[PDB]
Design a protein around this ligand. Structure first.
Ligand SMILES: O=C(N[C@@H](C(=O)NO)c1ccc(-c2cc(F)c(F)c(F)c2)cc1)C1CCCCC1
Ligand SMILES: O=C(N[C@@H](C(=O)NO)c1ccc(-c2cc(F)c(F)c(F)c2)cc1)C1CCCCC1
Ligand SMILES: O=C(N[C@@H](C(=O)NO)c1ccc(-c2cc(F)c(F)c(F)c2)cc1)C1CCCCC1
Ligand SMILES: [Zn+2]
Ligand SMILES: [Zn+2]
Ligand SMILES: [Zn+2]
Lengths: 519, 510, 520, 53
């Protein structure tokens, strides 16, 4: 654990992390719909659709164990309301014991199978019923068909979107913030769904924890304080850990990673966490996250309109995802596997000591690199981290990184792109995407572009001079640093930040965790 | 129709070369087992080395003592196989005749990609352009499958030909030596057809916008159809008004050239088992309209290429009309017009009505391609086809997703998308499946019209354009090929004719 | 106190000229009803002709010399006209058979000259003083001016006549000679005599401020500026205190300190105080933005039209406040206590700089999400406003080169005033009138406040949707005054005189008149 | 600031009076633009909706 340097004594020296969230105090009970719904305190919400009838009428199908509430919810009363996706209504009535109860529904549309994006819309509607209403309990009645993973996704998303991060509030805390203490879920074949509840809560915190690191500003989350957070996390989970400092990085000849951090007041810190199963180890995996805690662009300063330099605390979203995965893996303790969680953390700054456009630098596999643009720094840090990962002797290397802005022009803000040198590995990532419900799309590494990286003087160019398809070119670059290991690369530059909600998504935690678990 | 002119010097047709020197080349395919005769012209050995950039070593037998001595291992070791490197020497053979002998390096990979093979071909063509020859002979000392072999022939033919129509010598024989020569001979004349559909596409694209305008391009298509005995129909403004194609007619309002909608049809002999509509975007010049292409890098001087999709569809008509596949019916459609700045032009913010009744709020007059394609798709679905495939230089964002080498395909039907991907493998024109992400559909929800033409927020323009196109296909398998990044060869300063061979392979493979 | 240096040639103080040539001018005022003596130097008549646009010149004064009276009779003067700013020179012999120079400056046809029209008159007069080695100037007022305008005439003449040669070395003007005598003839002279030395005080306060502004950033840095402020306090016998970093850390000025993090010069907070002898009825804090160079920080001023080479003037507000301190310390008003405040720092690019997106904590506990490092002035003012309110004053007025949007709203002639108190604003407008430094009241539009709602901090530094930056910046500053009448004077558009390529010293007389009128 | 909702007016319905009681409304707050409304049966068993802004 290292000392965080300060310019002034008001500079913070750690990231505030909330571990014991109000979500963790929520008692969750799952009941089978066949037993009928008890409708008592709190708010009871039916999730209802009308297959085929766009904006069709609401009909409540479940048995309700209360004559008054059953009468209130009969078809002719409900027919003036419709199932339009995201609609909701509140109901007030007295039950059979003369206690007032609150009931309502959320519309789930007319399509039988909700997509992840449809389900998020339903959850957002449900959460607006939880905000600005001091409730002790929520009950949710599923009158829609969801498989096990989509049930888990529903809960993860509910937990994530209900939580409000006030770590940086001081004079402006929400006076009225109270969370429910109890969550009831009514669903058919409840016994098959119960196993998803604790998994959902683990997936929620891994995602929320990565979100807390991303949203933390760069004066709080810097290379020293971020690697201290990873040490603390590993201590709580009994993970092995090792933080490499500059000396050790110099000895390992990590010249591409070290050159990116030369201009920072914070020394480079390379994070290496390990989880090993107690049994026989049948699979070794390295997960690599880009960890740039602030990206000014360097001397290729982000000054062009739309370059969004104020967002760039988010350039360690990949590291955050990998650490959030370490929380889920360390908590759920999968068997027969050894996972290495890696991040070459640094800060990309303008200074007399910064590396320069045109500098030629030597990565740890001895390849010389001509720097054509100091703002393409992530691929330099990953080059050395990929060489480190391969020396571990793993079966798979997966990296995740907010690498290229061109992703916003290719897949946009909803799907990450995955690239790789190995079709089997790529299919497993896509399978994890489908079970985690974090969407990813396979994109090609087009070999015809490789020659635009030929350098007149160094072994290779960092950037292309001619090719504008920069996500593919960056993948071509990274591929040069994996000699003989199956490797995939997930570019989350376009999906990491939720611009509408002004917050991170913690994207990738569930994806990488499903990837580890199903292996 | 008569092409309107501003002055009498204004051109009134697209010059086209149908009969090209390529068509005079006599092609002969020989087996390698017999050894190679080196009696005239230039003879090139395609050789690899599976040591990286290691030395050239010739394995074929040559029936000539002098050339054999030239090719002995001690000489050729002075040369290397780095991809595209070549040397050729002139010398006298056993009968005191002058012959040229050389090689092209094919690298160290056993399987050549389409990109590598293109690099091999370019080095060959460079020698062809610098030497007065009567004959070229190519000796395949590498392994290529039938499709890759035909691709080599098409690419050689296409790159060898020089388009001199706007300016103010070729070999007469091609010899090929290859293992299992008999299995390759049927590819030869198919390559010749594929070359010409591609070169004809490229002639239309390279033709500037004063020669190639909606009128003269629909006239060119008529002449093409007459030569191939295809049914043909050109819709004018009167008929387009009757069909209420307001999106398409709006784009052309500011042009001096009337809109012309092209419709050709190929009908197979025998039972028709599949009906396909191929839809090409045909903007003969895209200035941007009032959303003028004035921004750095918007490259207005390239926008004669905005009809590359139409040209690909007409080049496919040539190939289909010439090879005459069976059991298929194909419609070749294009809504041709020109996007100009005028007192009569459509404006940013106009609300127009498409031919299916959907109102569209225009957010940017430079997103004109999707407006013309919308009315073209409503026309096509009314034909009752099984498949609609449209091909278009639609969004500049392709340059930032897949780049200049691979085109993007989006669609509403996985089986149709998979047929396109399979056609990409056998045509060796590279395509990559990109998604239509439904979560972005809400960005097209106009406050006043039924739908917005563009998003004001989402930067994934190629996906948003596909979501817009998809709104104009109700109940038909549909796919959309965005060739905006891939159509123009910036290094060679010429069109690629991209998509002809892809679409023809799609038709022929059913 | 010690200015850090990179190399030994770096300057360690701001060159400041206190005893200017203006101060060596003997000024005499005579009543015009006694007649004008024309003996020597240049004698300029200020002449209008009401109604008749471009009307003929007529010299109404009595001239106590037969030869010059004859030269100036109406027949001779008829070929000249009074178009505002026009001027002519005459040469003749007086009764003593000495040659004299005489002339006039046209003041137009409107009998009431505006602030801007009188500037035009002075500039024409000054053209007659330049490139002419004269020992004496006489001005005859044949136009009507109240007392504040006669003062404004003199202040302006003094300011424009002076030439700042502190940074000239091999290109000093070898012909630079200043008059040693100024004579003024005006109706009811006795009532205008008191304005002369006031104008001289107001001239130097303005000129002192312009010296600090024009001084480049390698001379005028946070340490050398606070050093000069101390030296001014000592000369004026003002109380003074300079707060360094350790004391600012103790005061928890996290907003102010973050801006200066990237600089080689330690932050210095200037605190000067004037206190009347006897009863103190009004307590006032004047707060001046003092960024000695504004690079933009990591939001570097690199966009076309951002004029990074002008950004030595970003301490203009601090300079106005120090100039006002000179005037108040010199004129010594009664019944008031005045605090002269400036949070001085430099906004630089470095490994140590604050970053876009940092969340920082102001001295009032509020957390701030930095959205643009180039909106640094409102951060330093935030902590300075908190400091000022803890002093327990009746009024807080701040003056700052805050927003470039002022060029698009009021432009280069009028400053904008914003505030939370109607009475204070009217006092500023009233002082604007008697100082002749023009100011226009602009609203603080509360509907925009929501765009400063931050997702993670208590407040955003900037709006991401509102383009009305002068108003948004005012809404931000309001969050740092809890219960005190406060006004904010944005001088970003009016501070630099782009045509003459020099500072105006704007605000010194406005603030001094504000203090003086509240004392009376 | 952002204090609880409290309804002063008397309403001539027993069902809605109970819904509007202080103990129920204080779970809601008056932050500008925040609203809730609920469907219920009134004394005549007619469907009505009651809320606040
Ligand atoms: O894609 C690039 N750079 C990314 C970067 O700076 N990596 O360390 C980059 C990554 C994300 C963004 C970005 C992402 C967003 F989601 C966004 F909203 C935005 F405004 C910018 C922009 C650039 C390259 C392009 C080639 C030259 C170097 C910069
Ligand atoms: O993608 C767009 N426009 C394309 C167009 O004009 N369609 O009619 C467009 C298509 C191709 C290019 C383009 C392609 C190139 F290969 C190229 F080199 C180039 F400079 C531009 C640019 C824009 C939209 C993007 C949404 C808003 C309007 C402009
Ligand atoms: O108004 C702003 N910035 C001013 C500033 O940097 N304050 O410390 C700013 C102030 C003055 C100018 C300015 C003033 C001039 F008189 C001028 F000629 C000029 F070119 C710029 C430009 C910007 C904001 C604009 C939105 C948030 C980022 C900075
Ligand atoms: Zn970068
Ligand atoms: Zn266009
Ligand atoms: Zn600034």
């Amino acid at each position: 654990a290292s000392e965080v340097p300060q310019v002034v004594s008001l500079d913070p020296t750690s990231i505030p992390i909330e571990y014991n969230t109000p979500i963790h105090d929520i008692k969750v009970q799952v009941y089978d719909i066949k037993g009928g719904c008890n409708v008592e305190e709190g708010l009871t919400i039916f999730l209802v659709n009308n297959p085929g009838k766009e904006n069709g009428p609401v009909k409540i199908s479940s048995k309700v164990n209360d004559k008054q509430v059953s009468e209130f919810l009969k078809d002719e009363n409900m027919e003036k309301f419709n199932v339009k996706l995201g609609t909701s209504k509140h109901f007030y009535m007295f039950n059979d014991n003369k206690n007032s109860v609150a009931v309502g529904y959320v519309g789930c549309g007319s399509v039988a199978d909700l997509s992840e994006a449809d389900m998020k819309r339903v959850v957002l509607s449900l959460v607006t019923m939880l905000h600005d209403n001091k409730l002790s309990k929520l009950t949710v009645v599923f009158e829609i068909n969801v498989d096990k993973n989509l049930f888990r996704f529903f809960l993860e998303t509910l937990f994530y979107e209900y939580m409000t991060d006030e770590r940086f509030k001081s004079t402006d805390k929400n006076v009225n913030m109270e969370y429910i203490k109890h969550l009831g879920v009514y669903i058919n074949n409840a016994d098959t769904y119960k196993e998803e509840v604790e998994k959902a809560r683990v997936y929620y915190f891994g995602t929320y924890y990565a979100s807390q690191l991303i949203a933390a500003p760069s004066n709080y989350c810097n290379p020293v304080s971020l690697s201290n957070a990873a040490v603390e996390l590993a201590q709580k989970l009994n993970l092995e850990y090792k933080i490499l400092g500059v000396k050790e990085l110099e000895e390992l000849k990590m010249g591409a990673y070290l050159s990116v951090g030369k201009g920072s007041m914070y020394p480079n810190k390379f994070i290496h966490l390990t989880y090993k199963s107690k049994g026989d180890v049948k699979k070794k995996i390295a997960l690599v996250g880009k960890g740039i805690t602030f990206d000014s662009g360097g001397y290729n300063l982000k000054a062009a309109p739309g370059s969004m330099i104020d967002l760039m605390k988010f350039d360690m979203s990949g590291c955050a995802a990998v650490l959030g995965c370490a929380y889920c893996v360390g908590t759920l303790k999968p068997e027969n596997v050894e996972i290495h969680f890696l991040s070459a953390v640094c800060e990309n700054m303008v200074s007399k000591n910064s590396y320069r456009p045109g500098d030629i630098i030597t990565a740890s596999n001895g390849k010389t690199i001509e720097v054509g643009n100091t703002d393409a720094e992530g691929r330099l840090t990953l080059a050395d981290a990929l060489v480190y990962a391969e020396k571990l002797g793993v079966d798979y290397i997966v990296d995740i990184a907010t690498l290229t802005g061109a992703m916003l022009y290719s897949l946009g803000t909803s799907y990450a792109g995955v690239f790789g040198n190995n079709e089997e590995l790529i299919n497993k990532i896509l399978q994890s995407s489908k079970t985690s419900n974090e969407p990813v799309w396979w994109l090609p590494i087009i070999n015809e572009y490789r020659a635009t990286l030929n350098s007149k003087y160094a072994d290779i160019n960092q950037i292309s001079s001619s090719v504008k398809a920069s996500s593919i070119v960056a993948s071509l670059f990274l591929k040069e640093f994996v000699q003989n290991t199956a490797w995939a690369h997930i570019d989350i530059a376009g999906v990491s930040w939720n611009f509408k909600a002004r917050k991170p998504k913690g994207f990738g935690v569930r994806l990488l965790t499903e990837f580890v678990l199903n292996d």
